[PDB]
């Protein structure tokens, strides 16, 4: 018999699909059988009538690499519908790295001491051993790597310190990571050359896994970032992520027109794949960039002065009597948002065929950017339902079917017999983000339940105590 069928709804299985009436059978960790299971015996037989089963949602872009550590609940994801996170973004990773005052950006993962694993092995195993309640896929990070290996960041690696790093990202790939991700636009990493990133991830053809990367530029300069993300590819010959898509600064608004058709010209001839964020503000280290100082900047959090967390940079720079770009450094280390995308750009790439879904939820922010709590539910109710930008099997596709793929997430992603009852049930009439950046924590509507591996683990808006979470292999 089934531990449970999920019956009367409306199953959007993660293929891109419309959705079509059926019942979805769970037996243990499996999907066991779709469709009109009245003839099947079941221990429990939950109407879902008037909503949805999809596929749990895969959070393609996040920084939860400490998170899943010190708060397995997982909370901020689980509230939204999120099964798995992709960890280790844009060159930063928790492991490994034994150090106590880490290099920003890197700060954004520490809760104070939070880099304490000498091997990315000692990492799994952490998680293995105390489970978070979303699958976990993580990616070593190239300024980790850097940061563990270079007693001087300010330059070019040597062939020693090359040959270090890729030691270490040989080992993390051997040890289960899915990828090597790269943030040169970074203080740790930006006087890396494209060589030093090629022979550092040289692990990946070998392995098989995924290069992600922050580009090098994201404004001005993109064309050329974007040139050098397609070259490391054709160089190391495995799949490539862009992530977090956009153009920045007003005198780029609109380019997302010029960098989706390179993009889509690259993937014809090369293996590539993008992410994206449903919101027009970015958040980050608190940075002195000319570029991403140019617009409207929140501090998340700051270290010198604690009560800075919330104000406005603007504010703050003038009664300190001192240009924004000024004060950055005397306020640092430190977060902040960054209002420098433009909606019709965001639109854009958010509906070009291939973006992927990724929150880039920034969860130790003391304020933080609302994506963390509301991205995937402003992208099925907000974009598609009532700005029609695309149809919820598309949006669902984009979220779940599309991000396994590209992530080699086997078995997972899809509605189908046979594969982990990772699944949400939501209802689609008032499915939305509720996190807006007054209230940037405030938990998503229309999330019914939520399972991961078979286990409800949201239920009833509360987290059901079920650490259910995997670590995953690609
Ligand atoms: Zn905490
Ligand atoms: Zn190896
Ligand atoms: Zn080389
Ligand atoms: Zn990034
Ligand atoms: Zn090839
Ligand atoms: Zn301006
Ligand atoms: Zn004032
Ligand atoms: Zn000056
Ligand atoms: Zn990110
Ligand atoms: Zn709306
Ligand atoms: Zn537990």
Same mark, same amino acid.
């Given at each position: 018999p089934f531990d449970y069928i999920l019956s009367?709804?409306?199953?959007?299985?993660?293929?891109?699909?419309?959705?079509?009436?059926?019942?979805?059978?769970?037996?243990?960790?499996?999907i066991a059988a779709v469709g009109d299971l009245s003839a099947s015996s079941a221990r429990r037989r939950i109407d879902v009538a008037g909503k949805v089963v999809?596929?749990?949602?895969?959070?393609?872009?996040?920084?939860?690499?400490?998170?899943?550590?010190?708060?397995?609940?997982?909370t901020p994801k689980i509230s939204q519908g999120v099964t798995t996170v992709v960890t280790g973004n844009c060159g930063i990773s928790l492991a490994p790295l034994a150090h106590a005052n880490p290099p920003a950006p890197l700060d954004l993962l520490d809760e104070g001491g939070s880099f304490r694993f000498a091997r990315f092995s000692d990492?799994?195993?952490? /998680?293995? #051993?105390? %489970?978070?309640?979303?699958?976990?896929?993580?990616?070593?990070?190239?300024?980790? =790597?850097? !940061?563990?290996?270079?007693?001087?960041?300010?330059?070019?690696?040597?062939?020693?310190?090359?040959?270090?790093?890729?030691?270490?990202?040989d080992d993390a790939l051997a040890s289960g990571a899915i990828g090597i991700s790269t943030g040169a636009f970074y203080p740790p990493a930006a006087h890396a050359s494209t060589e030093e990133i090629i022979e550092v991830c040289r692990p990946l053809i070998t392995h098989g896994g995924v290069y992600a990367?922050?580009?090098?530029?994201?404004?001005?300069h993109i064309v050329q970032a974007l040139e050098?993300?397609?070259?490391?590819?054709?160089?190391?010959?495995?799949?490539?992520?862009?992530?977090?898509?956009?153009?920045?600064?007003?005198?780029?608004?609109?380019?997302?027109?010029?960098?989706?058709?390179?993009?889509?010209?690259?993937?014809?001839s090369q293996?590539?794949? /993008?992410? #994206?964020? %449903?919101?027009?503000?970015?958040?980050?280290?608190?940075?002195?960039?000319?570029? =991403?100082? !140019?617009?409207?900047?929140?501090?998340?959090?700051?270290?010198?002065?604690?009560?800075?967390?919330?104000?406005?940079?603007?504010?703050?720079?003038?009664?300190?009597?001192?240009?924004?770009?000024?004060v950055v450094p005397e306020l640092q280390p430190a977060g902040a948002i960054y209002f420098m995308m433009d909606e019709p750009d965001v639109q854009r790439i958010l509906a070009f065929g291939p973006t992927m879904i990724?929150?880039?939820?920034?969860?130790?922010?003391?304020?933080?950017?609302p994506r963390l709590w509301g991205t995937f539910p402003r992208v099925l109710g907000h974009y598609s339902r009532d700005l029609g930008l695309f149809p919820l099997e598309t949006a669902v596709w984009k979220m779940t079917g599309l991000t396994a793929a590209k992530f080699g997430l086997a078995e997972r992603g899809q509605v189908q017999p046979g594969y982990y009852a990772d699944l949400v049930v939501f209802d689609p009439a008032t499915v939305a983000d509720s996190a807006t950046f007054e209230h940037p924590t405030e938990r998503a509507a229309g999330i019914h339940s939520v399972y991961v591996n078979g286990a409800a683990v949201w239920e009833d808006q509360s987290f059901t105590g079920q650490h259910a979470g995997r670590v995953l292999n690609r």
């Amino acid at each position: 018999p089934f531990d449970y069928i999920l019956s009367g709804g409306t199953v959007i299985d993660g293929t891109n699909a419309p959705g079509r009436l059926a019942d979805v059978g769970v037996r243990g960790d499996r999907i066991a059988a779709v469709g009109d299971l009245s003839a099947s015996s079941a221990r429990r037989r939950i109407d879902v009538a008037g909503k949805v089963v999809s596929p749990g949602f895969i959070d393609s872009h996040t920084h939860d690499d400490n998170y899943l550590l010190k708060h397995r609940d997982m909370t901020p994801k689980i509230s939204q519908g999120v099964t798995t996170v992709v960890t280790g973004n844009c060159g930063i990773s928790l492991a490994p790295l034994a150090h106590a005052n880490p290099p920003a950006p890197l700060d954004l993962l520490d809760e104070g001491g939070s880099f304490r694993f000498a091997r990315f092995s000692d990492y799994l195993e952490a /998680l293995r #051993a105390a %489970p978070p309640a979303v699958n976990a896929a993580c990616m070593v990070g190239h300024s980790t =790597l850097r !940061a563990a290996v270079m007693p001087d960041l300010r330059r070019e690696a040597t062939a020693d310190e090359i040959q270090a790093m890729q030691a270490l990202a040989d080992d993390a790939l051997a040890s289960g990571a899915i990828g090597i991700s790269t943030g040169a636009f970074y203080p740790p990493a930006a006087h890396a050359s494209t060589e030093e990133i090629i022979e550092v991830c040289r692990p990946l053809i070998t392995h098989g896994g995924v290069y992600a990367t922050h580009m090098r530029d994201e404004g001005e300069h993109i064309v050329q970032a974007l040139e050098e993300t397609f070259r490391i590819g054709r160089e190391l010959d495995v799949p490539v992520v862009i992530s977090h898509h956009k153009v920045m600064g007003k005198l780029n608004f609109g380019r997302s027109k010029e960098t989706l058709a390179l993009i889509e010209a690259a993937m014809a001839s090369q293996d590539v794949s /993008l992410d #994206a964020y %449903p919101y027009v503000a970015g958040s980050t280290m608190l940075k002195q960039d000319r570029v =991403l100082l !140019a617009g409207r900047t929140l501090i998340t959090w700051c270290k010198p002065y604690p009560e800075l967390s919330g104000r406005d940079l603007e504010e703050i720079a003038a009664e300190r009597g001192k240009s924004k770009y000024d004060v950055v450094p005397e306020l640092q280390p430190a977060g902040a948002i960054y209002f420098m995308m433009d909606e019709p750009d965001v639109q854009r790439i958010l509906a070009f065929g291939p973006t992927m879904i990724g929150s880039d939820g920034l969860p130790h922010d003391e304020r933080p950017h609302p994506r963390l709590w509301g991205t995937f539910p402003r992208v099925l109710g907000h974009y598609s339902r009532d700005l029609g930008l695309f149809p919820l099997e598309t949006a669902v596709w984009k979220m779940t079917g599309l991000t396994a793929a590209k992530f080699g997430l086997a078995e997972r992603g899809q509605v189908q017999p046979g594969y982990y009852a990772d699944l949400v049930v939501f209802d689609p009439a008032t499915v939305a983000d509720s996190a807006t950046f007054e209230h940037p924590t405030e938990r998503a509507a229309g999330i019914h339940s939520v399972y991961v591996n078979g286990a409800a683990v949201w239920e009833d808006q509360s987290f059901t105590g079920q650490h259910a979470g995997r670590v995953l292999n690609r």
